[PDB]
Amino acid sequence: SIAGITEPTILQYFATLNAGEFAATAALFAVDGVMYPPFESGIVGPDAIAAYLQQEAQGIKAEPQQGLAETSEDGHTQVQVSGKAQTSWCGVNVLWLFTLNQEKQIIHTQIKLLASPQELLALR
């Protein structure tokens, strides 16, 4: 769970991610949902998304600490979550920005790294 956030979709995003259930994580997105990761351009659809997560977020532990949520006037739920994404040898501070549709699918996710020198030695 995350401080300030009780939205089930977001809890599952991080739950499944930390179990290596990458296609389950990716299932949370609408079929044309987009992930915007730190170093590449956008990735479209659960398959490209699940590929990305499995062959990148390998060996990573996402550590969501706190979050905010809003409803925009078009009925979408906006959820911002801050935390860390660590490994054993290095980590990074992270802002996760989610937007959900009325059906609770992820329409898009942006992952922003809050920059440092360890981040500059990324594989990407």
Author numbering: 15 to 138
Question: Mind quoting what the paper says about this structure?
Answer:
In order to obtain a more homogeneous preparation of apo-AnaCTDH dimers, we added 2 M urea to the solution, which caused a large proportion of the high oligomeric states to disassemble, resulting in predominantly dimeric CTDH (solid line). Crystals were obtained in the presence of urea. The asymmetric unit dimer (hence called A-type or back-to-back) was formed via an interaction plane between the β-sheets of two monomers, quite distant from Cys103. PISA suggested that only the F-type dimer has biological significance, (ΔiGP value of 0.067 for the F-type dimer interface). The presence of the disulfide bond forces the formation of the F-type dimer of apo-AnaCTDH. The most striking difference between the apo-AnaCTDH structure presented here and the CTD-OCPO structure is a major shift in the position of the C-terminal tail. In contrast, in the apo-AnaCTDH structure, the C-terminal tail adopts an internal position, coming closer to the F-type interface between the CTDH monomers (CTD-NTD interface in OCP), partially covering the opening of the designated carotenoid-accommodating cavity in the apo-AnaCTDH structure. Owing to the steric constraints, the F-type crystallographic apo-AnaCTDH dimer is not capable of performing carotenoid uptake from the membranes, as the carotenoid channel is partially blocked by the C-terminal tail and filled with the Cys103-containing loop (hereafter β5/β6 loop), while in the A-type dimer, the carotenoid cavity is open. Thus the F-type dimer cannot accommodate the carotenoid unless structural changes occur.
OCP is a water-soluble, carotenoid-binding, 35 kDa protein found to induce dissipation of phycobilisome excitation energy minimizing energy flux toward the reaction centers. Unlike the wide variety of HCPs, the CTD homologs (CTDH) fall only into two clades, of which only one is present in Anabaena (a clade 2 CTDH). Recently, it was revealed that isolated CTD of Synechocystis OCP and CTDHs from Anabaena and Thermosynechococcus elongatus (a clade 1 CTDH) are also capable of carotenoid binding. Both CTD and CTDH were shown to mediate carotenoid transfer to apo-OCP, apo-NTD, or apo-HCP (from clade 4). Thus one likely role of CTDHs is to serve as intermediate transfer molecules required for delivery of carotenoids from membranes to the HCPs.
